[PDB]
Design a protein around this nucleic acid. Structure first.
Ligand SMILES: C[C@@H](P(=O)(O)O)P(=O)(O)OP(=O)(O)OC[C@H]1O[C@@H](n2cnc3c(N)ncnc32)C[C@@H]1O
Ligand SMILES: [Mg+2]
Ligand code: NA
Ligand code: NA
Ligand code: NA
Length: 326
DNA sequence: CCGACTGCGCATCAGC
DNA sequence: GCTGATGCGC
DNA sequence: GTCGG
């Protein structure tokens, strides 16, 4: 990019603080710094210049001119040499293994992929599927396959019931040329804030996607969130496509604009936009935007009839999805 | 310097 | 079974 | 780790 070396540095520090230190506020601070610096349209020449940016304090600036000077960071050098810290970091890359689990496995001998395979019976379901597909889930999905997946999802959802609206969100909706997984926002007229008429809407769609063998495994499933695994069909004598993570959120139809704002992200965009909401006296979740009273507790949902309405409430210029990749 | 950090679904366990 | 806390993930 | 009150 432009300051790739600095933003990789903060990212790696962010990952270490989350996974090893289990310090998620340092994790988020590091991630905030990485993204504003990733915005910032000049090559950073000193830490003092960077400290001018919101979210960059003294510690990070000192690390920046340490990195700017030598092209490395001693703190990261020894984090990378700590075989324990490196092993914790590695194990968290398995879907279902987080800081706590990864740490347990290391404290009891399990440090490598090979060690996990021999110890499959200490893994919950999610972890087990995450291990089975560890190689595939490290792979990114080219927008071209995302297009086939969408075609499949939107077509099978149309088959169950023509009133379902299915919307691919995440980095796909933001125009990325590759995505990490597939995020599908589902709505249906029979499910609103004031009334759920038919239930099992989400299950109706998941079962039809498994029946046609698109969805292959389940990680978690409830009445409004499906997290699982899918796979494009391949041709005769063709290597298979990698298996892919897929998430489906069933959101009430009258709440689509907040849902689609939440599910389009990016995650950092959502965190900054929601923090600005609070500074203007509002709270945003995937469902509603609500005032904070003079007490400081949420009131009634405000009428929303477009994504732009949410931006207007907090007095932000509309940002098209392509510009929400923070 | 201080609190205060975005928001929540599903799995899981502990305490009833 | 429940509520609540924690873990993990979006 | 940072910061606005
Ligand atoms: C990183 C890309 P990728 O999948 O192409 O690699 P993404 O933007 O699609 O992110 P994803 O993890 O799929 O969550 C999908 C969206 O869910 C929302 N979200 C995810 N994590 C969130 C968080 N911690 N707080 C608030 N909102 C959050 C925005 C994501 O775009
Ligand atoms: Mg995604
Ligand atoms: Na600063
Ligand atoms: Na993980
Ligand atoms: Na996802």
């Amino acid at each position: 990019t432009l300051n790739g070396g600095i933003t990789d540095m903060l990212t790696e520090l962010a990952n270490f603080e989350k996974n090893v230190s289990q310090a998620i506020h340092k994790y988020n601070a590091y991630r905030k710094a990485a993204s504003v610096i990733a915005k910032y349209p000049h090559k950073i020449k000193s830490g003092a210049e960077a400290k001018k940016l919101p979210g960059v304090g003294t510690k990070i600036a000192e690390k920046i001119d340490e990195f700017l000077a030598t092209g490395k960071l001693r703190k990261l050098e020894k984090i990378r040499q700590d075989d324990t810290s490196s092993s914790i970091n590695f194990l968290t890359r398995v879907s279902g293994i987080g800081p706590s689990a990864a740490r347990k496995f290391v404290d009891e001998g399990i440090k490598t992929l090979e060690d996990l395979r021999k110890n499959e019976d200490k893994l919950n379901h999610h972890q087990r599927i995450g291990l089975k597909y560890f190689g595939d889930f490290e792979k990114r999905i080219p927008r071209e396959e995302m297009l086939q997946m969408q075609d499949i999802v939107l077509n099978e959802v149309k088959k169950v019931d023509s009133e379902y609206i299915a919307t691919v969100c995440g980095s796909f909706r933001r125009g990325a040329e590759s995505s990490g997984d597939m995020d599908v926002l589902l709505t249906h007229p029979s499910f609103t804030s004031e009334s759920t008429k038919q239930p099992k809407l989400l299950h109706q769609v998941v079962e039809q996607l498994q029946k046609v063998h698109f969805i292959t495994d389940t990680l978690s499933k409830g009445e409004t969130k499906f997290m699982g695994v899918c796979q494009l069909p391949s041709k005769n004598d063709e290597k298979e496509y990698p298996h892919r993570r897929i998430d489906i959120r069933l959101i009430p139809k009258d709440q689509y604009y907040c849902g689609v704002l939440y599910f389009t992200g990016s995650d950092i965009f959502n965190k900054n936009m929601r923090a600005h909401a609070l500074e203007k006296g509002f709270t945003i979740n995937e469902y509603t935007i609500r005032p904070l009273g003079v007490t400081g507790v949420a009131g009634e949902p405000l009428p929303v009839d477009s994504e732009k309405d949410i931006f207007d409430y907090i007095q932000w210029k509309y940002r098209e999805p392509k510009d929400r990749s923070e």
